Amino acid sequence: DESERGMKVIESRAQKDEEKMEIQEIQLKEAKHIAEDADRKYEEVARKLVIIESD
Amino acid sequence: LERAEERAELSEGKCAELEEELKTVTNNLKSLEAQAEKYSQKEDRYEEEIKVLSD
């Protein structure tokens, strides 16, 4: 019961951690894409700053 | 940029105003120079006549 409960607690934990893993991984890809977008919008506006600044 | 451009416009505007003020004083200078020269020419005509009458 303790090794099985353990296995089930761990399976539950493993699943919580697996979901958090996948959730954080999917959300990481999105956070990275937001960083790409955040850097992208930064570049669009910063580039405008440079263009406007160049002008 | 609006200010840099404003300054381009303001300094260009003003330099254009100065071109007009400059042409105005240049033309007034030319007029006064021509006038002063017409007088210097009259002074010379008189000087020639002064020399003629003095002699």
Side-chain angles (χ1 to χ4, degrees):
Chain A
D1 288 343
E2 289 297 299
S3 292
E4 181 171 332
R5 183 181 69 80
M7 180 182 70
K8 290 175 182 176
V9 171
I10 296 301
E11 183 65 13
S12 179
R13 184 169 70 85
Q15 185 64 28
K16 287 187 287 188
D17 290 347
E18 189 178 68
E19 290 172 0
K20 288 176 183 181
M21 177 191 75
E22 290 183 347
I23 291 165
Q24 293 296 311
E25 63 185 342
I26 186 167
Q27 292 174 343
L28 174 60
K29 183 190 183 69
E30 184 63 14
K32 286 170 66 175
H33 293 306
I34 302 304
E36 183 178 2
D37 194 59
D39 289 311
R40 181 177 300 114
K41 67 178 75 155
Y42 166 74
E43 288 170 353
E44 292 296 304
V45 72
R47 189 181 304 109
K48 288 175 184 177
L49 189 154
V50 171
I51 291 166
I52 295 300
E53 184 177 4
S54 293
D55 286 346
Chain B
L1 173 57
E2 288 166 353
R3 285 188 283 269
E5 186 66 18
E6 180 178 351
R7 290 169 189 170
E9 291 171 354
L10 179 60
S11 293
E12 182 66 25
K14 184 64 176 174
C15 79
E17 289 174 355
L18 292 171
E19 290 178 349
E20 294 302 320
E21 292 180 51
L22 177 59
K23 287 184 290 187
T24 297
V25 298
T26 300
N27 289 338
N28 288 342
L29 175 59
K30 286 162 64 178
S31 180
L32 292 171
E33 183 176 0
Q35 182 182 356
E37 181 61 7
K38 287 171 186 177
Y39 292 141
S40 75
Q41 289 296 322
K42 292 294 293 293
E43 292 173 8
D44 287 349
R45 298 296 82 75
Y46 292 130
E47 187 64 15
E48 291 159 359
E49 292 175 1
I50 290 167
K51 288 187 289 190
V52 170
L53 291 172
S54 180
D55 290 345

Short mmCIF file of all heavy atoms in Angstrom, two decimals, chain B residues 1 7 10 13 25 27-29 35-36 42 47:
data_model
loop_
_atom_site.label_atom_id
_atom_site.label_comp_id
_atom_site.label_asym_id
_atom_site.label_seq_id
_atom_site.Cartn_x
_atom_site.Cartn_y
_atom_site.Cartn_z
N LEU B 1 11.95 64.71 -34.06
CA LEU B 1 11.97 64.80 -35.51
C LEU B 1 11.11 65.95 -35.90
O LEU B 1 11.46 66.70 -36.78
CB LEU B 1 11.47 63.57 -36.24
CG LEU B 1 11.34 63.74 -37.83
CD1 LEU B 1 12.61 64.14 -38.42
CD2 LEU B 1 10.91 62.44 -38.46
N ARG B 7 12.96 72.77 -36.81
CA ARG B 7 14.18 73.52 -36.81
C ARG B 7 14.70 73.54 -38.23
O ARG B 7 15.20 74.56 -38.69
CB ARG B 7 15.16 72.93 -35.83
CG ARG B 7 14.79 73.10 -34.39
CD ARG B 7 15.65 72.28 -33.52
NE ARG B 7 15.16 72.26 -32.17
CZ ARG B 7 15.63 71.46 -31.19
NH1 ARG B 7 16.63 70.62 -31.43
NH2 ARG B 7 15.07 71.50 -29.99
N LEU B 10 12.36 76.11 -39.52
CA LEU B 10 12.53 77.36 -38.83
C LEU B 10 13.82 77.99 -39.22
O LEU B 10 13.85 79.19 -39.49
CB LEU B 10 12.53 77.12 -37.32
CG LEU B 10 12.72 78.31 -36.40
CD1 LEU B 10 11.62 79.34 -36.60
CD2 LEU B 10 12.73 77.76 -34.98
N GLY B 13 13.38 78.55 -42.85
CA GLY B 13 12.40 79.60 -42.96
C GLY B 13 13.09 80.89 -42.68
O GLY B 13 13.02 81.81 -43.49
N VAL B 25 18.44 94.36 -48.16
CA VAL B 25 19.49 95.28 -47.79
C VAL B 25 20.55 95.34 -48.86
O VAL B 25 21.23 96.35 -48.96
CB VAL B 25 20.11 95.04 -46.41
CG1 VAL B 25 19.04 95.18 -45.34
CG2 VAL B 25 20.72 93.74 -46.34
N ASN B 27 19.89 95.12 -52.05
CA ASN B 27 19.32 95.98 -53.05
C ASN B 27 19.30 97.41 -52.55
O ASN B 27 19.52 98.33 -53.34
CB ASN B 27 17.95 95.49 -53.43
CG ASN B 27 18.02 94.21 -54.22
OD1 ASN B 27 19.05 93.88 -54.84
ND2 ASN B 27 16.94 93.48 -54.20
N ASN B 28 19.09 97.60 -51.25
CA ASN B 28 19.11 98.94 -50.70
C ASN B 28 20.54 99.41 -50.68
O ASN B 28 20.80 100.58 -50.92
CB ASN B 28 18.53 98.98 -49.32
CG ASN B 28 17.06 98.83 -49.30
OD1 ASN B 28 16.38 99.00 -50.32
ND2 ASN B 28 16.54 98.53 -48.15
N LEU B 29 21.48 98.50 -50.45
CA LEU B 29 22.88 98.85 -50.48
C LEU B 29 23.25 99.22 -51.87
O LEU B 29 23.94 100.20 -52.06
CB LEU B 29 23.78 97.71 -50.00
CG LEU B 29 25.31 97.95 -50.12
CD1 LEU B 29 25.70 99.14 -49.36
CD2 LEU B 29 26.03 96.75 -49.58
N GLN B 35 23.54 105.37 -55.46
CA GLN B 35 23.22 106.74 -55.14
C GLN B 35 24.46 107.46 -54.70
O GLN B 35 24.72 108.56 -55.17
CB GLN B 35 22.21 106.77 -54.02
CG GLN B 35 21.78 108.09 -53.63
CD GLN B 35 20.82 108.05 -52.50
OE1 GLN B 35 20.43 106.97 -52.07
NE2 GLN B 35 20.42 109.20 -52.00
N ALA B 36 25.22 106.83 -53.82
CA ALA B 36 26.46 107.37 -53.33
C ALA B 36 27.41 107.47 -54.49
O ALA B 36 28.17 108.42 -54.55
CB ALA B 36 27.00 106.49 -52.23
N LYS B 42 28.91 112.82 -59.29
CA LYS B 42 28.62 114.24 -59.35
C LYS B 42 29.70 115.01 -58.66
O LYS B 42 30.02 116.09 -59.12
CB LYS B 42 27.29 114.60 -58.71
CG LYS B 42 26.04 114.11 -59.41
CD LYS B 42 25.82 114.75 -60.79
CE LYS B 42 25.51 116.27 -60.75
NZ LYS B 42 24.18 116.58 -60.11
N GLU B 47 34.21 118.09 -59.20
CA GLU B 47 35.62 118.24 -58.95
C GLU B 47 36.30 118.60 -60.24
O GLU B 47 37.20 119.41 -60.26
CB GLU B 47 36.23 116.98 -58.37
CG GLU B 47 37.67 117.12 -57.93
CD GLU B 47 37.85 118.11 -56.80
OE1 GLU B 47 36.88 118.47 -56.18
OE2 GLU B 47 38.96 118.48 -56.54
#
